[PDB]
Amino acid sequence: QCGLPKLMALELFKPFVMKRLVDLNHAQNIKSAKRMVERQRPQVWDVLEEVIAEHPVLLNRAPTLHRLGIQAFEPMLVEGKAIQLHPLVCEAFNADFDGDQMAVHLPLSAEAQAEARILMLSSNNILSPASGRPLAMPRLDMVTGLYYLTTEVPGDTGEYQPASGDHPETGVYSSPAEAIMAADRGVLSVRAKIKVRLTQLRPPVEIEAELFGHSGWQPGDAWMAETTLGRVMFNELLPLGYPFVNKQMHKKVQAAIINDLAERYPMIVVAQTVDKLKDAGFYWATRSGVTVSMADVLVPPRKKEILDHYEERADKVEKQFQRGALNHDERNEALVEIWKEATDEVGQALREHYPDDNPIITIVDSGATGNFTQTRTLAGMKGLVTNPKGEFIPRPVKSSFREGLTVLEYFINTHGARKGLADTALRTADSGYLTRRLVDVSQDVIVREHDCQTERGIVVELAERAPDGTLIRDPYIETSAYARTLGTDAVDEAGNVIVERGQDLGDPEIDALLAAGITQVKVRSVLTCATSTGVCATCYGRSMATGKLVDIGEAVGIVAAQSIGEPGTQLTGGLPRVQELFEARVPRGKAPIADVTGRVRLEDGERFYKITIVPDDGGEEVVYDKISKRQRLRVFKHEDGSERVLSDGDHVEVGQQLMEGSADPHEVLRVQGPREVQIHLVREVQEVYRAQGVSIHDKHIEVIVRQMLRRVTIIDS
Amino acid sequence: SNNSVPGAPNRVSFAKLREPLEV
Amino acid sequence: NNPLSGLTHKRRLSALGPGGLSRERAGLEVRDVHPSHYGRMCPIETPEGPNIGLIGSLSVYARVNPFGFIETPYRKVVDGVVSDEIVYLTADEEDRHVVAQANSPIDADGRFVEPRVLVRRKAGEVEYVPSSEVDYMDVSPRQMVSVATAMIPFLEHDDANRALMGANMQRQAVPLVRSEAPLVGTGMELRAAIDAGDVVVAEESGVIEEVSADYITVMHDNGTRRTYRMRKFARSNHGTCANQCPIVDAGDRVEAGQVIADGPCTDDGEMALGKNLLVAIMPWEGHNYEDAIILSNRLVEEDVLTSIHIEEHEIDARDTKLGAEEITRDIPNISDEVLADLDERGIVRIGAEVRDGDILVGKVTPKGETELTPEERLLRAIFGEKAREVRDTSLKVPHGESGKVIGIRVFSREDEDELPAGVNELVRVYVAQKRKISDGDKLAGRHGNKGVIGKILPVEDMPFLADGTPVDIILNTHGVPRRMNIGQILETHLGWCAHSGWKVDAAKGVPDWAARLPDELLEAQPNAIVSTPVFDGAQEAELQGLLSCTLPNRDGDVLVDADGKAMLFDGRSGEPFPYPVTVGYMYIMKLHHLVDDKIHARSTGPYSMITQQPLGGKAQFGGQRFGEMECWAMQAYGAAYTLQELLTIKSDDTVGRVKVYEAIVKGENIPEPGIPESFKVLLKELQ
Amino acid sequence: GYDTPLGITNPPIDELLDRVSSKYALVIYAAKRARQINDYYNQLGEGILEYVGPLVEPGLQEKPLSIALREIHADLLEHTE
Amino acid sequence: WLSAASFQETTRVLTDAAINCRSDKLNGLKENVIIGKLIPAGTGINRYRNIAVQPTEEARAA
Amino acid sequence: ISQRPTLSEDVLTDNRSQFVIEPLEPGFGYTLGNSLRRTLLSSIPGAAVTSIRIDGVLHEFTTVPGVKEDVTEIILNLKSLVVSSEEDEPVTMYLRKQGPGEVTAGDIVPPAGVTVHNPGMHIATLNDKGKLEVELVVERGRGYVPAVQNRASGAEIGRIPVDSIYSPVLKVTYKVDATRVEQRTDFDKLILDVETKNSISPRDALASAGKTLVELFGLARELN
Amino acid sequence: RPTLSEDVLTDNRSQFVIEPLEPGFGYTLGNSLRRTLLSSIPGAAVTSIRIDGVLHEFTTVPGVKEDVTEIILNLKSLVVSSEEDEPVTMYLRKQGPGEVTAGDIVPPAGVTVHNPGMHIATLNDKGKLEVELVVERGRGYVPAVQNRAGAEIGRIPVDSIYSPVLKVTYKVDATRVEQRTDFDKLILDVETKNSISPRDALASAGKTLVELFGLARELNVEAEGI
DNA sequence: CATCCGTGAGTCCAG
Ligand SMILES: [Mg+2]
Ligand SMILES: [Zn+2]
């Protein structure tokens, strides 16, 4: 739903209302009915309420970066002249309320309304088509409000007390209807750990097996729990049939719940359940006691003690440079390191000095909003500011904003503050440009078939083999495997197949292969499957927005483009590296790769690096020429020790990156072929969005890259 | 006081004494 | 918009323009804050968008020398001793010398306290230097800022980003029916208002011989008399209400240079950009979520955030080929009910009430003698009504506008008034609007804390203090520590102590925290005004102390504690809020971004001449743009028909949009879209 | 098992999707029927041989889309691509 | 040539396309949007576009 | 575990009065006095000016010759006028004064059944040669009624509609002394604080509140 | 327009719909009506108990499945109506194998048990059970520490749920009367014991509050319109 | 592998 202004609606449904004005005979013809609307006669406000009945409208907010930039709503009339918006779609639109204006378009045709209600309605688009994570989820006050009541407080009043002496066990209530009356009188805290008998909530899976034998929990069956009253109220929203959760609601906790509701439970349950969460948050956010004063914001106690230790350490480096024993490149390189450490120790000074009661920490540690780096800037210190060049300034801002920055501190801070804003405005232009390029190249890419039926797929590292034994979950699991579909039966050591082919990978199914011991699965991909036009359905797999197999007809290429371009504002490799790969430029680094695998022959000179390679299988030696400014990349050797930098006598695979930098994809092609260059690009691209905390599923990248290799040159006519 | 020049309302000021020159 | 808005504009320094640089030519070096900007050009005052860094305000104390460079005052130090002798130094003339910061501690004679003091040097480099090498020192702490920037209390507690907006938004403040001076000030409010020239300042000393709302007459000493006429309810450049009112009562003794009458946003000769409201720092029922704002209905019921806006509407009568347009009260096929507010001429009568669509000036024009419809001929035979050859071209009221007609101006070529070639009668109608504050109206403070009005609760719904006083504005906690602008919090603290009044404990001597406090502030009355100059003013130790000295109310009870907080009661449920909430006063400005202006929509309307698409803007009553980025979002969803609908039958399908209207009013089905006329144009452009 | 769907959330979309191949398919499925019903009212006044009227009880001033979407839920319509 | 034209270097595309006498098959997203056709995606494809809805035989006028 | 009917005590002050009510249920006092507070501030009847008319004046935005204030600032001063009318139907007051000197609420003449409770209220400062002739209209009502509603009815181009604040209630609060002592001595004591505009008594205000509330709570007792 | 009263039903509980209230009287009515039902209605429950084979709490009763804790709780759920204000005492004795219920209870004259099928404790063979209950009257909810002084040869303090009302919530939406979309709509959820109907519990809760606002009205009975 | 010319360098709004 959304609050459409009565004034806006009248002109929007203008020919629709005139219709029902000559209908019920308020006006004699089509001409007069128009006058009635223009005069805003009292009759029409009863007519309009009828017209807009279940007739969806559209809300657009520029810049429209991803498709969720436009979401359809059920129109609700409202007094005032402003458009009333739901708090949960603030993430999708990226719409704060400091004076945003939203566009409104009225779908007309019978098809148009059908499209809007079904495809584009806010309640059906809860997930991010880019990642699959919930966008329509608790975000600011809502998360802070929920995080409140689900927090377990030790000594709080009304707490459970064991029996000892002449007084019985304090803290046990027969039912949730009892403890509610207890906090009303003022005996029980809503955050205090107690013991209660519940009759309308399914117990934990681990406990349900203990108290029923999984006989099937039923509404009416009672059970005892050790939670807080607030955690009970929370689980009534999930609601029934969902295993009770006994933690404090950090954003990551709540995110998990919704993402689990997204997988199993139907859309209209999630839609209504998430509605229940929002109302819960705001009510308690008001009664959370989160308030900013001069007191709560506290400067550290060892403020000047720590800063004097690192200023004394800094005067030793300035005197060691005064004697000219340190290089001018090393002085600043040493100075930056001293102060970076200083800022950290000031940060530690806050966390232990600040109560968990403290609101400023409460908001930050709970995933509500704001970083601790802000809180450090607020109470601790500003630290290093950026130079015009970009390098960090040798001089530090020791003051916090609570203490009042000096005249000269404010000046150098502002400079960096403005250059930050300037760069921000320029990357957006770049990103939005990069966006439109990815769109054009991937327009013909549509889901056309249900299955290509080719067995070609690509291998994905499920988990690394831990040195001591057992395994470690791979860092790239989420974005590379979790949404893929299997193109080959996954077998462990035994002949037993854990997961078939043509099976979508889900969370428990990755847990089926992770415990089985198998660390590599072959998965269907955009690259491999080959269809006449566009791509097939099966390879693409599970649509990140639906949590199910992609429908036939989705313009996945555009969504891919949008998925990549949407968060492209938050970069520092950086965004230039993003263009360098999709545009396939001969890189800046130009890191050399081995043309043939064999034993390495390092022969460094102080003036120049030279690398010679003795072919493993007979062959003639192939030798390269490298600049001393670049350095050898610590590649994972046969010794399974990646930190081993390139040494002579080492053994490299074919196409192995010799030095640090960026390999030339065109050389990767001629050396390692059309398929390997696809996996290089995709993961080189990924590494950039990784470092800045952006998770795009590999699926979207591959769509674009596929459209890079659809052509082969003509050697002989 | 801050600006006792024109005949203005007295706006008391936290300050170190500022007498270099008026704006 | 306001007097401050005007003043700053005149103190603008733009790099753009003929002989200067273009926007695209300007790299990143030009825009950032240069070291030499100290005391000359403000490092904070600059626009936010694509014009950042290329537009700056001139600093307060700087002046322009006969060659076109920017000088700035410095105090001269002969040999460690500060001298009152002042010399202006240009940018490069300052680089050869060595300057001390203004706040460096000085002996009562003029000597420095410590040998090594804070020093400014060429290339923005800073180091400690013995007192023997000090040449000059800064005039004032607030020397590097501009005029608007110097009106931001506790500026040294806010990050440059938000403080940049706070300054830029002050010029956006709307004049209110009557304006109150802020409880918390900086001292700049005075000198800013006077130099603005939209207040009234006496030229020569004397006595008020006579006073009216119309004008003030001053009887000088030498016997001569000067009379200042009051600007009363005049339309500005930006539809704001420039209204002036007398300060002095009849018979007052006034000396020269004294503000005898203030104008918009001015209280007793001080910049009055907003009101002093009772603030509460807490999330409340989600209505303040993401920087929105909650209001108390008192502010509507007492016109606290109400402003006046004048619009100037025009229409002329020209010589045509079919005759000439004549303004008359006789308009074809109009009832006398609609013409009831017109004079015998056809003009609206002064003081009348107009609504959107009504008639302001009745003008008719002779229409081209084209063969009238054979179907309308027939219709004119049955009812026997002979058609007139005059078509209605009257000035009606634009959509959105509404108010009272506060003045008519009429020029006629007949009465020898000089008009351009072709015009006979030209009428102007001034209509004002008394807009009370409503939902969606942009409210902001001096600290870059902006926000539109979320919800205005009934006065009883407002969380309130122990003595029953309901707050005015409910700001959301979450949106404070992120922006680093906790100056808004310090303002609230000092804002409460200024409202409550205080008294430092003199028994057992003067307290050590209030040791640096000037004598005049140890004792303050309720509703007292105070200054907190930038890079000076109150410190955190004193502000904490003052919260302890908080004088009790009428009932003898203190309301807030030393933490600055207090206990509230939820007016809805009744139960007291469980935790102490920070309460005080904050100066809030009404910006010029009101829903009455910003709201706009359209079903059908005018269209472009070539592309046949809808026109653009509210002023043209045009449709929104569904551009390239919006089209991707549609294409992404897989909403083929919606997207097709928007660009065809909703845009420039000449026969289509027409055949969509009918289908709707006939209650039928929407037909299949045709060919976009825009495409045909492209094809004829290629040919 | 859920709470009673209010307004435009009814009929619930999950049960609506159980009878159709995909999200997009349901759109043309319903709209073309919503088109048929609106033809029926307009035609009936002057033209016989209209498409068959709504197979369920019409809500008071119910939208033809809202009508069609309900009978889809009632499995009273046949599906062809 | 249409999709290419409305992308970049507009004048370069046209000079080549005119000499090459390239005939554009209007079967793409950028293509169809410009001419105002239903985009060949989602609800636009013939699989979903050509659908016949009829009442069940069991369903009958009362 | 005790039964006692409640009381309604009173400790006074000329303008404001404290009402003491006890003994009430434990944890009840806060939501009881608030139910009263929200009744006083919003729905207590009174009388106030709705429209006015000034000689030589045709709208709100101009100046009367020889008068120090503008019509807006004058109409703004009249918002603090305290009036109590008994006539359920509109009545017309008057004010005519000339020459030098100050005009106040005292120079207003209420007809039969209308009374001014604050004659010392400054209105306009008429200097020499100045004349002011006003014609004030007072109505009965409750709460707050915006001026804008009068204009459309049919009012002539002379009348200038003015906002109305009917509520004669100034400031309301309450405090509670809950004896939370571990015994059957747990009760809540209520101390209501009511301040008026000298248009009505603080007591008379609490009475109308109760009268309203009683007739509202009576529908929960009626049977189906 | 005058206000109405609606009802949406279930056996033990129901929802009441009040609209349209004058703008801002939804929250003026809400919390005030809830605390009344919860605290201002008299009933009867259990004040204190006494067990035969108990000298301290941690040990369960010899021959009983449930802990001393789980029995107190089940007894808290016992709905009882007493005719006399003065505290009465009922005995419950049972031995051997089986299950003890609320129908096995021996109630005094003028004292009734309303749910005789309530599970309380499961006894095994050679399992003896002798318990003394103390039944009082009152309103609302009273803590256990306030009832710490039964015979000190095993007196146990129990939470006293006198109130025949179990749990009440309320929501305030806005209905659109005339042109005004300001009027308030009050929705009230009320769940009671098996002693009194929710429909009845509200009328007495209604009548009670009428008594309170009478004190103010008595002075002058000035004006109002319905 | 480095130069010279031509073509790019986010959206909506207001005005
Ligand atoms: Mg925004
Ligand atoms: Zn395939």
mmCIF file with all atom_site columns, C-alpha atoms in Angstrom, chain A residues 465-558:
data_model
loop_
_atom_site.group_PDB
_atom_site.id
_atom_site.type_symbol
_atom_site.label_atom_id
_atom_site.label_alt_id
_atom_site.label_comp_id
_atom_site.label_asym_id
_atom_site.label_entity_id
_atom_site.label_seq_id
_atom_site.pdbx_PDB_ins_code
_atom_site.Cartn_x
_atom_site.Cartn_y
_atom_site.Cartn_z
_atom_site.occupancy
_atom_site.B_iso_or_equiv
_atom_site.pdbx_formal_charge
_atom_site.auth_seq_id
_atom_site.auth_comp_id
_atom_site.auth_asym_id
_atom_site.auth_atom_id
_atom_site.pdbx_PDB_model_num
ATOM 1  C CA . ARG A 1 465 ? 41.229 -28.715 2.383   1.00 0.00 ? 465 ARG A CA 1
ATOM 2  C CA . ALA A 1 466 ? 42.410 -27.673 5.844   1.00 0.00 ? 466 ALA A CA 1
ATOM 3  C CA . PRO A 1 467 ? 46.110 -28.517 6.452   1.00 0.00 ? 467 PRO A CA 1
ATOM 4  C CA . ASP A 1 468 ? 45.612 -30.344 9.758   1.00 0.00 ? 468 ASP A CA 1
ATOM 5  C CA . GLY A 1 469 ? 42.729 -32.263 8.194   1.00 0.00 ? 469 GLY A CA 1
ATOM 6  C CA . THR A 1 470 ? 38.980 -31.751 7.702   1.00 0.00 ? 470 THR A CA 1
ATOM 7  C CA . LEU A 1 471 ? 37.871 -28.769 5.593   1.00 0.00 ? 471 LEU A CA 1
ATOM 8  C CA . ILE A 1 472 ? 37.280 -25.010 5.553   1.00 0.00 ? 472 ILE A CA 1
ATOM 9  C CA . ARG A 1 473 ? 34.326 -23.370 3.809   1.00 0.00 ? 473 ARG A CA 1
ATOM 10 C CA . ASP A 1 474 ? 35.511 -21.533 0.696   1.00 0.00 ? 474 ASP A CA 1
ATOM 11 C CA . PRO A 1 475 ? 35.242 -17.717 0.788   1.00 0.00 ? 475 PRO A CA 1
ATOM 12 C CA . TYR A 1 476 ? 33.562 -17.709 -2.645  1.00 0.00 ? 476 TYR A CA 1
ATOM 13 C CA . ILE A 1 477 ? 30.834 -20.231 -1.765  1.00 0.00 ? 477 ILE A CA 1
ATOM 14 C CA . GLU A 1 478 ? 27.925 -17.792 -1.578  1.00 0.00 ? 478 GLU A CA 1
ATOM 15 C CA . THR A 1 479 ? 28.444 -15.962 -4.857  1.00 0.00 ? 479 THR A CA 1
ATOM 16 C CA . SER A 1 480 ? 29.743 -18.827 -6.996  1.00 0.00 ? 480 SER A CA 1
ATOM 17 C CA . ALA A 1 481 ? 27.820 -21.955 -6.019  1.00 0.00 ? 481 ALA A CA 1
ATOM 18 C CA . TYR A 1 482 ? 24.760 -21.278 -3.876  1.00 0.00 ? 482 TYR A CA 1
ATOM 19 C CA . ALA A 1 483 ? 22.324 -20.467 -6.701  1.00 0.00 ? 483 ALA A CA 1
ATOM 20 C CA . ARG A 1 484 ? 23.753 -22.768 -9.377  1.00 0.00 ? 484 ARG A CA 1
ATOM 21 C CA . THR A 1 485 ? 22.083 -25.905 -10.757 1.00 0.00 ? 485 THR A CA 1
ATOM 22 C CA . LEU A 1 486 ? 23.930 -29.237 -10.999 1.00 0.00 ? 486 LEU A CA 1
ATOM 23 C CA . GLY A 1 487 ? 24.991 -30.614 -14.373 1.00 0.00 ? 487 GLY A CA 1
ATOM 24 C CA . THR A 1 488 ? 26.588 -33.742 -12.913 1.00 0.00 ? 488 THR A CA 1
ATOM 25 C CA . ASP A 1 489 ? 25.713 -36.093 -10.055 1.00 0.00 ? 489 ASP A CA 1
ATOM 26 C CA . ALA A 1 490 ? 27.781 -35.209 -6.990  1.00 0.00 ? 490 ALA A CA 1
ATOM 27 C CA . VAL A 1 491 ? 29.350 -38.335 -5.509  1.00 0.00 ? 491 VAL A CA 1
ATOM 28 C CA . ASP A 1 492 ? 31.445 -38.688 -2.353  1.00 0.00 ? 492 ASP A CA 1
ATOM 29 C CA . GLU A 1 493 ? 34.176 -41.313 -1.951  1.00 0.00 ? 493 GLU A CA 1
ATOM 30 C CA . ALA A 1 494 ? 31.524 -44.033 -1.841  1.00 0.00 ? 494 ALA A CA 1
ATOM 31 C CA . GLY A 1 495 ? 29.356 -44.812 -4.853  1.00 0.00 ? 495 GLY A CA 1
ATOM 32 C CA . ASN A 1 496 ? 26.497 -42.994 -3.145  1.00 0.00 ? 496 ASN A CA 1
ATOM 33 C CA . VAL A 1 497 ? 25.273 -39.854 -4.926  1.00 0.00 ? 497 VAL A CA 1
ATOM 34 C CA . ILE A 1 498 ? 24.430 -36.993 -2.581  1.00 0.00 ? 498 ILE A CA 1
ATOM 35 C CA . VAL A 1 499 ? 22.865 -34.646 -5.147  1.00 0.00 ? 499 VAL A CA 1
ATOM 36 C CA . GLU A 1 500 ? 21.577 -35.531 -8.626  1.00 0.00 ? 500 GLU A CA 1
ATOM 37 C CA . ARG A 1 501 ? 21.941 -33.598 -11.869 1.00 0.00 ? 501 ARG A CA 1
ATOM 38 C CA . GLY A 1 502 ? 19.252 -31.026 -12.608 1.00 0.00 ? 502 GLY A CA 1
ATOM 39 C CA . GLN A 1 503 ? 18.989 -30.161 -8.935  1.00 0.00 ? 503 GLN A CA 1
ATOM 40 C CA . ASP A 1 504 ? 19.045 -26.576 -7.636  1.00 0.00 ? 504 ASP A CA 1
ATOM 41 C CA . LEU A 1 505 ? 21.625 -25.947 -4.929  1.00 0.00 ? 505 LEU A CA 1
ATOM 42 C CA . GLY A 1 506 ? 20.025 -24.797 -1.685  1.00 0.00 ? 506 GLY A CA 1
ATOM 43 C CA . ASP A 1 507 ? 21.418 -24.107 1.786   1.00 0.00 ? 507 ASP A CA 1
ATOM 44 C CA . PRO A 1 508 ? 20.872 -27.570 3.281   1.00 0.00 ? 508 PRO A CA 1
ATOM 45 C CA . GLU A 1 509 ? 22.051 -29.142 0.020   1.00 0.00 ? 509 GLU A CA 1
ATOM 46 C CA . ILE A 1 510 ? 25.399 -27.367 0.273   1.00 0.00 ? 510 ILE A CA 1
ATOM 47 C CA . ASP A 1 511 ? 25.427 -28.817 3.787   1.00 0.00 ? 511 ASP A CA 1
ATOM 48 C CA . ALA A 1 512 ? 24.829 -32.224 2.199   1.00 0.00 ? 512 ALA A CA 1
ATOM 49 C CA . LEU A 1 513 ? 28.037 -31.936 0.182   1.00 0.00 ? 513 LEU A CA 1
ATOM 50 C CA . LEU A 1 514 ? 30.065 -30.057 2.820   1.00 0.00 ? 514 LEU A CA 1
ATOM 51 C CA . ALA A 1 515 ? 29.773 -32.887 5.345   1.00 0.00 ? 515 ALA A CA 1
ATOM 52 C CA . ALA A 1 516 ? 30.050 -35.615 2.712   1.00 0.00 ? 516 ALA A CA 1
ATOM 53 C CA . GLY A 1 517 ? 33.671 -34.574 2.221   1.00 0.00 ? 517 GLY A CA 1
ATOM 54 C CA . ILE A 1 518 ? 33.400 -33.613 -1.436  1.00 0.00 ? 518 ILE A CA 1
ATOM 55 C CA . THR A 1 519 ? 34.951 -30.184 -2.099  1.00 0.00 ? 519 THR A CA 1
ATOM 56 C CA . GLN A 1 520 ? 34.241 -29.731 -5.815  1.00 0.00 ? 520 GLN A CA 1
ATOM 57 C CA . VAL A 1 521 ? 30.996 -29.742 -7.817  1.00 0.00 ? 521 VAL A CA 1
ATOM 58 C CA . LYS A 1 522 ? 30.312 -29.293 -11.529 1.00 0.00 ? 522 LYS A CA 1
ATOM 59 C CA . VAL A 1 523 ? 27.561 -26.729 -12.071 1.00 0.00 ? 523 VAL A CA 1
ATOM 60 C CA . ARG A 1 524 ? 25.554 -25.522 -15.064 1.00 0.00 ? 524 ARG A CA 1
ATOM 61 C CA . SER A 1 525 ? 26.472 -21.988 -16.112 1.00 0.00 ? 525 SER A CA 1
ATOM 62 C CA . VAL A 1 526 ? 25.607 -19.255 -18.594 1.00 0.00 ? 526 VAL A CA 1
ATOM 63 C CA . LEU A 1 527 ? 28.950 -19.712 -20.330 1.00 0.00 ? 527 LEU A CA 1
ATOM 64 C CA . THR A 1 528 ? 28.662 -23.440 -20.976 1.00 0.00 ? 528 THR A CA 1
ATOM 65 C CA . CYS A 1 529 ? 25.060 -24.022 -22.030 1.00 0.00 ? 529 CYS A CA 1
ATOM 66 C CA . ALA A 1 530 ? 24.659 -23.204 -25.700 1.00 0.00 ? 530 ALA A CA 1
ATOM 67 C CA . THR A 1 531 ? 21.361 -22.238 -27.277 1.00 0.00 ? 531 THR A CA 1
ATOM 68 C CA . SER A 1 532 ? 20.499 -20.611 -30.608 1.00 0.00 ? 532 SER A CA 1
ATOM 69 C CA . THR A 1 533 ? 19.455 -17.250 -29.175 1.00 0.00 ? 533 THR A CA 1
ATOM 70 C CA . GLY A 1 534 ? 19.882 -16.062 -25.596 1.00 0.00 ? 534 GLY A CA 1
ATOM 71 C CA . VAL A 1 535 ? 20.289 -18.628 -22.824 1.00 0.00 ? 535 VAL A CA 1
ATOM 72 C CA . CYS A 1 536 ? 18.288 -21.621 -21.573 1.00 0.00 ? 536 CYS A CA 1
ATOM 73 C CA . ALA A 1 537 ? 16.432 -21.781 -18.254 1.00 0.00 ? 537 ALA A CA 1
ATOM 74 C CA . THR A 1 538 ? 18.164 -24.628 -16.418 1.00 0.00 ? 538 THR A CA 1
ATOM 75 C CA . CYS A 1 539 ? 21.744 -23.322 -16.551 1.00 0.00 ? 539 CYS A CA 1
ATOM 76 C CA . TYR A 1 540 ? 20.855 -19.856 -15.290 1.00 0.00 ? 540 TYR A CA 1
ATOM 77 C CA . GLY A 1 541 ? 19.068 -21.607 -12.463 1.00 0.00 ? 541 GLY A CA 1
ATOM 78 C CA . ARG A 1 542 ? 17.371 -20.063 -9.471  1.00 0.00 ? 542 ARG A CA 1
ATOM 79 C CA . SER A 1 543 ? 16.234 -16.479 -10.027 1.00 0.00 ? 543 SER A CA 1
ATOM 80 C CA . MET A 1 544 ? 17.736 -14.499 -7.146  1.00 0.00 ? 544 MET A CA 1
ATOM 81 C CA . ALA A 1 545 ? 14.457 -12.625 -6.733  1.00 0.00 ? 545 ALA A CA 1
ATOM 82 C CA . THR A 1 546 ? 11.995 -15.534 -6.786  1.00 0.00 ? 546 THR A CA 1
ATOM 83 C CA . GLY A 1 547 ? 14.059 -18.163 -4.981  1.00 0.00 ? 547 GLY A CA 1
ATOM 84 C CA . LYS A 1 548 ? 12.894 -20.572 -7.665  1.00 0.00 ? 548 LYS A CA 1
ATOM 85 C CA . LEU A 1 549 ? 13.791 -21.616 -11.210 1.00 0.00 ? 549 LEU A CA 1
ATOM 86 C CA . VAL A 1 550 ? 13.864 -18.639 -13.574 1.00 0.00 ? 550 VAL A CA 1
ATOM 87 C CA . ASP A 1 551 ? 10.707 -18.193 -15.652 1.00 0.00 ? 551 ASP A CA 1
ATOM 88 C CA . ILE A 1 552 ? 10.869 -18.393 -19.447 1.00 0.00 ? 552 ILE A CA 1
ATOM 89 C CA . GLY A 1 553 ? 11.175 -14.878 -20.849 1.00 0.00 ? 553 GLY A CA 1
ATOM 90 C CA . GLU A 1 554 ? 13.254 -12.969 -18.305 1.00 0.00 ? 554 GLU A CA 1
ATOM 91 C CA . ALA A 1 555 ? 15.648 -10.384 -19.778 1.00 0.00 ? 555 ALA A CA 1
ATOM 92 C CA . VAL A 1 556 ? 18.317 -11.577 -17.353 1.00 0.00 ? 556 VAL A CA 1
ATOM 93 C CA . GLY A 1 557 ? 21.025 -9.616  -19.177 1.00 0.00 ? 557 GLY A CA 1
ATOM 94 C CA . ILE A 1 558 ? 19.581 -6.256  -18.224 1.00 0.00 ? 558 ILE A CA 1
#
